[PDB]
Amino acid sequence: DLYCYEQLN
Amino acid sequence: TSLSLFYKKVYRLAYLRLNTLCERLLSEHPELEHIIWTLFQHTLQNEYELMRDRHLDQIMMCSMYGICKVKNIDLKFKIIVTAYKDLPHAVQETFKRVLIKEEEYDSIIVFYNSVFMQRLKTNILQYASTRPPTLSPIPHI
Amino acid sequence: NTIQQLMMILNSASDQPSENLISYFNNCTVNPKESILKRVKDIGYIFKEKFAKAVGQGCVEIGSQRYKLGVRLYYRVMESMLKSENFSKLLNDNIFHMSLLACALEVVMATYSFPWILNVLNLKAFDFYKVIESFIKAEGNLTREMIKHLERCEHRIMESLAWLSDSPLFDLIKQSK
After folding, report:
1. Which residues from B are below 8 Å from A3, CB to CB?
2. Which residues of B touch A1 (CB under 8 A)?
3. 3-state secondary structure of C165
4. Nearest CA among C143, C138, C157 for reference residue C73
5. Contact at 8 Å (CB) between A4 and B106?
6. Which of C130, C154, C164 sits opposite B53 (nearest CB)?
7. What CA–CA distance (Å, rounded) separates B110 from B97?
8. For chain C, what are the domain ranges?
9. Transmembrane region positions (chain B)?
10. Distance CA C63, CA C44 (A)
11. For the purposes of burial, counting CB atoms within 10 Å of the CB of C141, is it exposed (0-12), middle (13-18) or buried (19 or more)?
């Protein structure tokens, strides 16, 4: 899908 | 005219920055930049309220990430953000601190998942098709 | 350095419009002389009070001196623009004068060191932006470093300041679109 599974670090 | 001039300047700036990130991160996959550009330009002209109290580069990075998402091209937002930092004027607050809702602030990833991608999902998904994309003209200079 | 050379000339220039400028003022269907002079005076008051608060010493002369250099640059640039060319419309335009004046002041602030000046003159970033390129084109004494600084100010406005809530940009988009 288009969701981003990231955490900024 | 004033507005048209203004937009021309904005598009030129936006594309130049886009081109720099793409030539660096999407070395292979050269067809994407013109698609990312089309989404970016569509956002500025048609979804301009996404710019209110925000930064052009936030829309830029979100456009890059979204297109590479449909195209199933492995390109992490972290990688984008890390490359973004090497732009001369680039400041990390631009991706670490982004206006989300009323006066809530969070990372660019939160802005992407919760605002940008919600607003542009159908426009972005149109790139899932194998048909020739109808692309926006690359801005002059 | 061309900026240093410019400050020298401004330092020796008079505080009021030249005879050439005045001539243009008189050619205006609606003579702008008094409002132009009054604006210079009102802004001088605001600038010095704000500069003093910032830096200190109950209304500094450094601030008063910086402002004079700015007004002189402002008349110089106004002069060259008018010479290179409805002057009544132009010369009677509030945005023209306030932005040209702020741009002149930004150059002086930057040499003796950007949106601080916008707050001081109560100028919207989008309104200011409109004169930057013209000012750069009209002023032959800018150094490469000053041109990049002004270009950077323009970019900052194009990338975020012109998109802040209450910006006249949104009102313009809506009416066109």
Report:
1. 113, 117
2. 69
3. coil
4. C138
5. no
6. C164
7. 10
8. 1-177
9. none
10. 9
11. middle
Resolution of the experimental model in angstroms, please?
Answer: 1.9
CB C175 within 8 A of CB C157: no
The helix or strand, by DSSP H or E, that contains position B99, with its residue range, turns out to be strand B98-99
Q: How was this structure determined?
A: X-ray
Q: Which of A2, A7, A9 sits opposite B69 (nearest CB)?
A: A2
Q: What range defines the domain where residue B27 resides? A: 1-141
Helix (H/G/I), strand (E/B), else coil: B90: coil
For testing the chain C interface, which of B1, B4, B5, B6 should be mutated: the one with the most C CBs within 10 Å?
B6
Burial, C95: exposed, middle or buried (Cβ in 10 Å; 0-12, 13-18, 19+)?
A: middle
Residue at B4: amino acid letter: S
> Long-range contacts of range C147-151, CB-CB < 8 Å, 24 or more positions apart?
C149/C110, C149/C114, C150/C103, C150/C106, C150/C107
**DSSP at B87:** S
Q: Two tokens at B132?
A: 């020739």
Q: How many distinct structural domains can be found in chain B? A: 1
Cα B84 from chain centre = 12
Taking the C-alpha atoms of C169, C172, C174 and C177 in order, what is their torsion angle to the nearest 10 degrees?
Answer: -120
The verdict on a CB contact (< 8 Å) between C152 and B56 is no
Determine the Cα–Cα distance for residues C163 and B53; give it in Å rounded to an integer. Answer: 6
Contact C41, C16 (CB under 8 A): no
Can you give the CATH number for the domain in which B132 is found? Answer: 1.10.472.10
Residues in chain B preceding a C-to-N separation beyond 2.5 angstroms (breaks): none
What distance in Å separates the CA atoms of residue C96 and residue B6, rounded to the nearest whole number?
17
Give the side-chain half-sphere CA count within 13 A for C115.
17
| Overall CATH class of domain C1-177 | mainly alpha
Short-list C130, C128, C110, C109, CA closest to C118: C128
